[PDB]
């Protein structure tokens, strides 16, 4: 039977999903789509066999999960998909109301990781639905991914005079480093039972991936007609973000993960088993 | 600006057209929906859907809320494969007895019906159920399969238990010397009127797709035949069985189709077929 595969709805994984339906990958899959925080749950409890994972929810379940090297959702500088939109200073978001998007695990992690240890402020955090418009009239900030963060970040925000702070741009600010928002991984024993599929699998994820890059003008073009966003901006959009997954990229990982880990339910010195070439 | 809500019939039939639509990248113009042709065909008629195929029986009902695509279908002229009665007892020998209508079909029933009744004189005790061979088997003395379940008990499960399996494609071919149209591929009037060019450019793009899937139909049998219970060369015979064409001698199959059913299954025998009028 094909694999299940997960697939990130949002728009940075959209030329993601050119590249395996020209390859005709697709086929090769049973594809789920939806947001990333709803394919960690389903991978992790045995409804997908391969699929996106953000970070934060891969490295609690790192023993069970093998990733797939060079790919994953990430970047070097700004990621313009990961913001804090803020009606104040961050430094004065001290003791205030906060809003966290549902979507969101590892950038709201992110956010949180900032807001306390660069910019000194605990604010009071809360859980809701993405939807900036209802976030800005209950919290003084708000913290979103996906399709809500690029909207917030390109349109409502300039069009609102609302500060909007990267969460890319803000942690290569602190470290230096890039980062990675989510990486692709099969389940331990998937992978263990058909590891040929599993190779299979992302080698045609790298072929996607690889593909999309060269189209990325193509891909553009055909969502501006049905996005928010004109194609120029979907063309940046997509070529800012960095979906490589080497050693640069691992270091960031390990980095970000001794930070958060003693707060967040993983160790700090976690292990990322990487799926090995034959 | 949002993508047309596009159906796509979930069967094997239609796994080449989907393999063109992704080749393509038509795919990424379309939020589309896979599901069985039953459930996509009461989708589009109530508004859940705004472009997609629907099953002959229930386009007629619907003709005049309808705009049918010209040039692709789903269809046959002679054995269709995956529409087939399989039965324990020879088809004369119905009369009185049990038959099984799988749940997912709405045409291939009708057609079954119409053969049973009008070809081979018969008037069994229908009964609708989802589509389980074993069950039916073991409950009833025949029944009518579509898509992936007809295909099986037409290569697989008839061959393996000593069952006969009609071809309806075929049995419509020997009763009037016509080809047969199942499932037609249509837009919502109100959709059509109002998003004219999109419809257009969706109904090329369906075209597009079907060509190359017939150019490339061994490399989808070639990759299908991974993960499906029969092999390449039954798949690549099953996707060159099918005709996609939607013409005028499909048209006339449709009409011949309609004039005998319609005064029994609720739409008029003169049913007109709107098509999708190209630009001048
Ligand atoms: C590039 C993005 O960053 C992500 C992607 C997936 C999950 C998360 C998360 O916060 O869990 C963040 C984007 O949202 O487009
Ligand atoms: C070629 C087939 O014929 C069909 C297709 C779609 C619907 C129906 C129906 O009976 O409603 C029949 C197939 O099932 O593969």
Same mark, same amino acid.
């Given at each position: 039977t094909r694999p299940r595969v997960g697939h990130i709805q949002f728009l940075n994984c959209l030329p993601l999903y050119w590249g395996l339906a020209r390859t005709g990958?697709?086929?090769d899959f049973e594809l789920t789509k939806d947001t990333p &925080? @709803?394919?960690?749950?389903?991978?992790?409890?045995?409804?997908?066999?391969?699929?996106? %994972?953000?970070? %934060?929810?891969?490295?609690?379940?790192?023993?069970?999960?093998?990733?797939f090297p060079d790919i994953a959702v990430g970047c070097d500088g700004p990621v313009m998909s990961c913001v804090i939109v803020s009606q104040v200073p961050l430094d004065r978001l001290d003791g205030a109301r906060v809003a966290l998007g549902s979507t969101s695990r590892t950038s709201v992690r992110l956010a949180q990781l900032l807001?306390?240890?660069?910019?000194?402020?605990?604010?009071?955090?809360?859980?809701?639905?993405?939807?900036?418009?209802?976030?800005?009239q209950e919290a003084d900030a708000a913290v979103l991914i996906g399709d809500?963060?690029?909207?917030?970040?390109?349109?409502?925000?300039?069009?609102?005079?609302?500060? %909007?702070?990267?969460l890319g741009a803000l942690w290569k600010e602190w470290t230096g480093l890039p980062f990675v928002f989510a990486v692709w991984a099969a389940r331990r024993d998937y992978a263990e039972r058909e590891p040929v599929i599993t190779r299979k699998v992302h080698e045609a994820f790298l072929a996607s991936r690889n593909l999309s890059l060269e189209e990325? &003008? @193509? %891909?553009? &073009?055909?969502?501006?007609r049905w996005e928010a966003?004109? &194609?120029d901006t979907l063309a940046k959009f997509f070529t800012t973000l960095d979906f490589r997954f080497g050693a640069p990229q691992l270091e960031a990982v390990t980095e970000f993960a001794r930070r958060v880990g003693p707060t967040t339910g993983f160790p700090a010195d976690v292990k990322v088993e990487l799926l090995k070439p034959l």
């Amino acid at each position: 039977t094909r694999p299940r595969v997960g697939h990130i709805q949002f728009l940075n994984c959209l030329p993601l999903y050119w590249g395996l339906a020209r390859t005709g990958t697709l086929l090769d899959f049973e594809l789920t789509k939806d947001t990333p &925080e @709803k394919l960690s749950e389903q991978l992790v409890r045995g409804d997908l066999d391969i699929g996106p %994972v953000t970070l %934060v929810e891969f490295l609690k379940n790192a023993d069970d999960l093998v990733a797939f090297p060079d790919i994953a959702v990430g970047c070097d500088g700004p990621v313009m998909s990961c913001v804090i939109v803020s009606q104040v200073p961050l430094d004065r978001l001290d003791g205030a109301r906060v809003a966290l998007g549902s979507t969101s695990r590892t950038s709201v992690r992110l956010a949180q990781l900032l807001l306390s240890e660069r910019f000194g402020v605990q604010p009071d955090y809360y859980t809701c639905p993405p939807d900036l418009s209802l976030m800005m009239q209950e919290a003084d900030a708000a913290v979103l991914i996906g399709d809500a963060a690029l909207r917030a970040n390109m349109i409502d925000g300039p069009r609102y005079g609302l500060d %909007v702070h990267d969460l890319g741009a803000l942690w290569k600010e602190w470290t230096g480093l890039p980062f990675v928002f989510a990486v692709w991984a099969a389940r331990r024993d998937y992978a263990e039972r058909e590891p040929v599929i599993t190779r299979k699998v992302h080698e045609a994820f790298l072929a996607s991936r690889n593909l999309s890059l060269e189209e990325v &003008e @193509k %891909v553009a &073009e055909q969502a501006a007609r049905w996005e928010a966003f004109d &194609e120029d901006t979907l063309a940046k959009f997509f070529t800012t973000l960095d979906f490589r997954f080497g050693a640069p990229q691992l270091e960031a990982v390990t980095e970000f993960a001794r930070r958060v880990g003693p707060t967040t339910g993983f160790p700090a010195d976690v292990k990322v088993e990487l799926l090995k070439p034959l």
